[PDB]
Design a protein around this ligand. Structure first.
Ligand SMILES: Cc1cc2nc3c(=O)[nH]c(=O)nc-3n(C[C@H](O)[C@H](O)[C@H](O)COP(=O)(O)OP(=O)(O)OC[C@H]3O[C@@H](n4cnc5c(N)ncnc54)[C@H](O)[C@@H]3O)c2cc1C
Length: 456
DNA sequence: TCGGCTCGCGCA
DNA sequence: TGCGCGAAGCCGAT
């Protein structure tokens, strides 16, 4: 609908209707940023064509009770900064509390909205809210993919079996969809306290905090500063200092050579399209650029593909047939060790490498990418059943990862435990034909002892 | 009816 | 450390 630097394939209609005479409302959810946001840019362009202002609404749900203070504070502090940035562009933001299915519909009527726009998430709960809102409004409802470089429904029309089949489809569409962002034009027409929501939510989550023996908190909040401004700083330091060595050291957890962008990417405080634009233009090791681009383009956006075309993305049923048949055959194998959720959570296994990985997770909220594979695969090896392993890995991932509760997490766990986007490997007890990883294999790839000593 | 897929292992 | 191979099931280009 209108636009010159505005590709209409990024937007799709969720509900037809008569465009009201009120303001355009951007229901912001996944992409919590003011710059490099196609959903906010499309909302502004529609408002300009109708000579109305654009407003932003955010609904704080009860979902923060299922996680911890680490994610709540990170999100909320980012939203406080975002509120000021939108105010500088004369864009007011409204923060609601409750069920989006009820609050968003009530806000549309009470504010006499003319058009509703939201960003795109393939998670189940977002589809439920969208269906509830459609049944409660009479104005047009649009959805914009602001998170993927290529719109999820455009990159592929089906579940992609492997990255090597998805890779040519995605890269063929890069020349069309990889582009610069236009500037967010401020509003022309003029038209709950976040500090109170922060204190009320923290007081609720306090009894569930992760503590050590001295009742001292485990989480170290100084590793990652939240917000759109801090995300840009992280990206800049990655390109200048770490991108060159990324290809060689990406799988060495003793070196801080990752981009460290996932907390910002998950909450949408930075755009992956922006990161890709800057990495494309940087002059660095070609093998490092290719390796990093493959991670933030192929693997990130195939995770959205997985969740979008497999609504059981967090269940055993989503695994490929060969993996289900293999794991079913080994359900009666004696496990060398069986640990409960509580024993995994406290890092009380026999494996010091596994315990150190859990300690990095508990203390920093961001486990290194390589040890996340080892961490999840040992949960499968030392659990009663594949379903219990899946349940334990998802629980700990979403509870403690700053970047958790994310398509990348469900696809990554499904890769580790059920071979989604992987292939069959040598037959073993318990784990069957699922790709195996061993302590001795890690010892030959990086200094395992240094990683263990850093995290007790 | 093939070719090639994001481990462990033996060997420089 | 870096390389080549093994062990596995299957998509997709034909
Ligand atoms: C068991 C398991 C659980 C994971 N949990 C999550 C999760 O909850 N949330 C999450 O965003 N990712 C998760 N990952 C993927 C990956 O581990 C992290 O995205 C990565 O470590 C994030 O840190 P980084 O940004 O410094 O990594 P970088 O090496 O700098 O990669 C940059 C970005 O590329 C994407 N990316 C990288 N690796 C993957 C991958 N394997 N799959 C999909 N996208 C990827 C990410 O968006 C990432 O932020 C998980 C992977 C596994 C195997």
């Amino acid at each position: 609908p209108r636009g010159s630097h505005m590709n209409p394939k990024r937007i799709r209609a969720l509900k037809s209707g008569k465009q009201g005479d009120g303001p355009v409302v951007y229901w912001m959810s996944r992409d919590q940023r003011a710059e490099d946001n196609w959903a906010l840019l499309f909302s502004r362009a529609i408002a300009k064509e109708a000579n109305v202002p654009v407003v932003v609404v955010f609904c704080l749900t009860d979902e923060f009770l299922e996680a911890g203070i680490r994610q709540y504070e990170f999100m909320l502090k980012g939203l406080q900064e975002l509120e000021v940035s939108l105010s500088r562009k004369k864009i007011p933001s409204f923060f609601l509390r409750g069920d989006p299915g009820e609050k968003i519909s009530r806000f549309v009527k009470d504010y006499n909205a003319g058009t509703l726009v939201t960003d795109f998430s393939p998670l189940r709960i977002k589809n439920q809210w969208i269906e509830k809102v459609i049944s409660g409004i009479s104005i047009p409802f649009f959805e914009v993919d602001a998170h993927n470089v290529v719109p999820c429904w455009e990159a592929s029309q089906k579940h992609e079996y492997a990255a090597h089949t998805f890779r040519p489809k995605l890269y063929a569409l890069l020349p069309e969809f990889l582009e610069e962002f236009p500037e967010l034009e401020p509003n022309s027409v003029t038209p709950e306290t976040l500090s109170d929501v922060l204190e009320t939510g923290v007081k609720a989550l306090l009894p569930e905090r992760a503590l050590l023996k001295n009742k001292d908190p485990l989480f170290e909040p100084w590793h990652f500063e939240p917000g759109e401004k801090a995300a840009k700083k992280v990206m800049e330091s990655f390109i200048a200092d770490r991108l060159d060595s990324y290809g060689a050291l990406r799988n060495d957890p003793t070196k801080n050579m990752l981009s460290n962008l996932s907390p910002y990417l998950h909450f949408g405080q930075i755009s992956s399209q922006r990161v890709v634009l800057e990495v494309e233009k940087a002059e660095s090791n070609p093998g490092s650029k290719k390796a990093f681009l493959d991670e933030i383009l192929i693997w990130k956006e195939i995770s959205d593909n997985f969740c979008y075309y497999n609504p059981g993305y967090d269940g055993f049923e989503s695994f490929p047939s060969w993996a289900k048949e293999s794991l079913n055959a080994h359900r009666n194998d004696v496990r060398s060790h069986i640990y409960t959720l509580e024993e995994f959570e406290a890092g009380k296994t026999h494996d010091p490498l596994w315990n150190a990985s859990q300690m990095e997770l508990l203390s920093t909220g961001k486990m290194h990418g390589y040890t996340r594979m080892y961490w999840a695969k040992k949960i499968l090896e030392w659990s009663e059943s594949p379903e219990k392993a899946l349940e334990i890995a998802i629980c700990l991932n979403d509870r403690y990862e700053l970047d958790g509760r994310d398509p990348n997490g469900y696809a990554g766990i499904a890769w580790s435990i059920g071979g989604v986007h992987d292939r069959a490997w040598g037959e073993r007890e318990v784990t069957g034909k699922i790709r195996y990883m061993s302590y001795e294999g890690c010892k030959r790839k990086f200094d395992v002892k240094l990683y263990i000593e850093k995290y007790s």
